[PDB]
Amino acid sequence: PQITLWKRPLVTIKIGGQLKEALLDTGADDTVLEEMNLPGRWKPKMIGGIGGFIKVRQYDQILIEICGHKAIGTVLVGPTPVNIIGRNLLTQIGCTLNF
Amino acid sequence: PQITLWKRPLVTIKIGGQLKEALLDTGADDTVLEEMNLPGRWKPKMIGGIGGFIKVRQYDQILIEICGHKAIGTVLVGPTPVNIIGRNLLTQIGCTLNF
Numbered sequence: 001p002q003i004t005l006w007k008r009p010l011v012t013i014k015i016g017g018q019l020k021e022a023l024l025d026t027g028a029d030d031t032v033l034e035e036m037n038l039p040g041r042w043k044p045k046m047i048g049g050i051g052g053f054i055k056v057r058q059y060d061q062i063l064i065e066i067c068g069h070k071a072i073g074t075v076l077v078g079p080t081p082v083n084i085i086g087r088n089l090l091t092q093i094g095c096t097l098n099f
Numbered sequence: 100p101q102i103t104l105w106k107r108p109l110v111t112i113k114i115g116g117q118l119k120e121a122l123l124d125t126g127a128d129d130t131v132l133e134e135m136n137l138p139g140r141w142k143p144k145m146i147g148g149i150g151g152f153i154k155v156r157q158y159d160q161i162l163i164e165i166c167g168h169k170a171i172g173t174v175l176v177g178p179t180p181v182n183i184i185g186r187n188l189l190t191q192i193g194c195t196l197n198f
């Protein structure tokens with residue numbers, strides 16, 4: 001599909017057996033999701049942007065479905081104010097910017 | 100152009116007569132640039148990111164050329180970690196997401 005940018009590019013994702021709304025974010029290197037108790041091992045990480053850094057848990061090889069397009073990669077979980085689909089997964093679903 | 104996301108979507112912009120590098124950022128509502136000198140009036144504003152809120156200077160109706168496409172809109176100037184082009188200007192240059 002084609003997503004205009006008049007409004008936030010929010011889409012439905014499926015992760016860890018749950019459906020959620022997330023932002024398709026070309027400004028994010030990697031993917032950051034709201035607090036959720038995923039199974040498996042993880043390692044602590046710090047990610048920063050406007051306003052400073054937050055503490056997150058890094059999970060590797062997590063399967064996410066984004067608008068019916070499957071992707072598998074690293075997912076950071078923590079007190080992010082919004083679910084952010086970053087380039088690590090956007091590339092896997094063939095997402096591009098066009099103007 | 101069509102821009103893939105294997106690398107950060109960095110482009111050259113022209114603002115206030117100076118060239119800079121900025122990130123096309125579909126997860127940003129607004130455009131925020133690092134500390135710089137711009138002519139004209141401005142008003143204090145607050146903007147919140149993944150880490151919290153920062154103080155910025157709001158410049159309205161600013162001419163900015165993004166990858167050869169002209170825009171005139173609001174530019175926020177403050178301690179952002181990177182120059183980001185937000186949806187307020189991405190819409191002006193006709194940018195969409197496609198997958």
Ligand SMILES: CCOP(=O)(COc1ccc(C[C@H](NC(=O)O[C@H]2CO[C@H]3OCC[C@H]32)[C@H](O)CN(CC(C)C)S(=O)(=O)c2ccc([C@@H](C)O)cc2)cc1)OCC
Binds near residue numbers: 047147183
């Ligand atoms: C309930 C809402 O809470 P808030 O309002 C903020 O919500 C948010 C917070 C963040 C975002 C996404 C970010 N956008 C953003 O900063 O946009 C600003 C400017 O325009 C405004 O629009 C939205 C906010 C304003 C951006 O796309 C991506 N970033 C990197 C850029 C900065 C280089 S990143 O997130 O920092 C990030 C850092 C490291 C990594 C690792 C993993 O690679 C992955 C992502 C969108 C909405 O207040 C909270 C106190």
